[PDB]
């Protein structure tokens, strides 16, 4: 969870709309997608 807190500041500054009514939705969506394991079997498919 603390490493998730490290991700959260990065996703809040770099991957969100800069509006107070949109930032929590965009940050929640990106942090969902980043931890998604279907998008992680792709990046180590060179190890096949």
């Amino acid at each position: 969870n603390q490493s998730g807190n490290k991700l959260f500041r990065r996703f809040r500054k770099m991957n969100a709309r800069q509006s107070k009514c949109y930032e929590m939705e965009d940050v929640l969506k990106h942090h969902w997608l980043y931890t998604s394991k279907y998008l992680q079997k792709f990046m180590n498919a060179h190890n096949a």
């Binding site: 969870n1 490493s3 998730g4 929590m24 929640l28 969902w32 394991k37 992680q40 079997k41």
Partner: protein
């Protein structure tokens, strides 16, 4: 990504990457609220509708001026939608685990999932300009991770999934984001109570879910362990951190823990704290204040989050390292022979220890203890560098 794609397509001719909207229309398979599922006992007080994703975290709080004022912003998934999207994400790994454990693929046994909860408040986030509520400058993140998945076969349970990096930043999945104080109780309960409702609902059901052409059934075990000590004291209805009652697992006082120091046993649980708050509130024996606090062993609030009694490991590192840091700073001054000391003598002991730690162990000094400082500090090289500054040698062998 847009200007990378634009440059690659405008230079090399052909379209190697994909445009943005294709990524948008192919990311909806991975967000929650896409797949069908059902619960075989339908869950109490939550709809069976299966296309809800990013919903508001306030759950329709009364935002009128005639009410208790709210000023926070909260967005959350539904808990069952997040669980099914996580399981359909881990689908392929589940299949490969059932292959590699010499099982079949077409089983639909009662898969027991064991998941881990974590909640922790962040500080120094900045509210923006513009319209909106008077939002505080903190944040609370509730997130979970899927620790292991077993299945029952024959009479033994085999592990068809076990997470390799349980403390990674890639496996904790976010669930509820809000901007409120960790220690402000009321808005914290106002946001977190729907999540607890969904959890105590789905703790007694069987999720049926299609995994590659076959329906399969999952049961769940929730383990709340990713909580720091302060939040366990706050939401488990126990007292504050500096009380006479220290441990969140056993019933002992601070002076008793310095006389026995080893032999205890775990006694605190969630049902016990609920019954003890009922004892405190009802006062069914008509005792005084202090005899009642002895009777209830420090429970003075209603516990509203069920958790497992355990030990946070990271903060155990940091706390033990700061306690050893104070021991080192107190041994170079020989406080066992100078039991009285000024402020400035202790300040000078601290400055001497800081200079010698930078000279020896290449450590810059910090006021807030970290984890890397804690791992670099708890060596034998640091006790050699500190033993260089003690005049005695009995203190040398004791520190060693």
């Amino acid at each position: 990504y847009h200007k990378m794609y634009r440059t690659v397509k405008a230079i090399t001719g052909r379209q190697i990457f994909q445009p943005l909207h294709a990524l948008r229309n192919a990311e909806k398979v991975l967000l929650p609220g896409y797949h069908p599922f059902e619960w075989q006992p339908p869950l109490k007080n939550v709809s069976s509708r299966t296309d809800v994703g990013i919903i508001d975290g306030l759950s329709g709080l009364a935002s009128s001026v005639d009410e208790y004022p709210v000023d926070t912003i909260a967005k959350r998934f539904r808990y069952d939608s997040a669980l099914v999207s996580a399981l359909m994400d881990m689908e392929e790994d589940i299949l490969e685990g059932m292959r590699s454990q010499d099982l079949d693929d077409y089983l639909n046994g009662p898969f027991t999932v064991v998941v881990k909860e974590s909640c922790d408040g962040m500080g120094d986030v900045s509210e923006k300009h513009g319209s909106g509520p008077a939002v505080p400058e903190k944040a609370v993140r509730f997130s979970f991770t899927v620790m292991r998945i077993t299945i029952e076969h024959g009479s033994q349970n085999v592990k068809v999934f076990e997470e390799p990096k349980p403390n990674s930043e890639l496996c904790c999945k976010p669930l509820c984001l809000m901007l409120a104080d960790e220690s402000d109780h009321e808005t914290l309960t106002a946001i977190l109570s729907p999540l607890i409702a969904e959890r105590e609902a789905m703790k007694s059901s069987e999720l049926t879910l299609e995994m590659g052409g076959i329906p399969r059934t999952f049961k769940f075990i929730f383990r709340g362990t990713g909580y720091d000590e302060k939040l366990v004291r706050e939401v488990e209805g126990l007292e504050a951190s500096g009380s006479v009652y220290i441990c969140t697992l056993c019933d002992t006082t601070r002076l008793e823990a310095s006389q026995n120091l080893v032999f205890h046993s775990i006694t605190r649980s969630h049902a016990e704290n609920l019954q003890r708050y009922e004892v405190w509130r009802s006062n069914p024996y008509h005792e005084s204040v202090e005899e009642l606090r002895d009777r209830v062993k420090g429970v003075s609030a209603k516990p509203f989050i069920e958790t497992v009694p355990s030990i946070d490991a990271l903060h155990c590192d940091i706390g033990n390292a700061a306690e050893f840091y104070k021991i080192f700073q107190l041994e170079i001054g020989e406080v066992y022979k100078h039991p009285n000391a000024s402020k400035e003598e202790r300040k000078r002991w601290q400055a001497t220890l800081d200079k010698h730690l930078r000279k020896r162990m290449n450590l810059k000094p910090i006021m807030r203890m970290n984890g890397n400082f804690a791992r670099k500090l708890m060596t034998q090289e640091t006790v050699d560098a500190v033993c260089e500054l003690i005049p005695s040698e009995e203190r040398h062998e004791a520190l060693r």
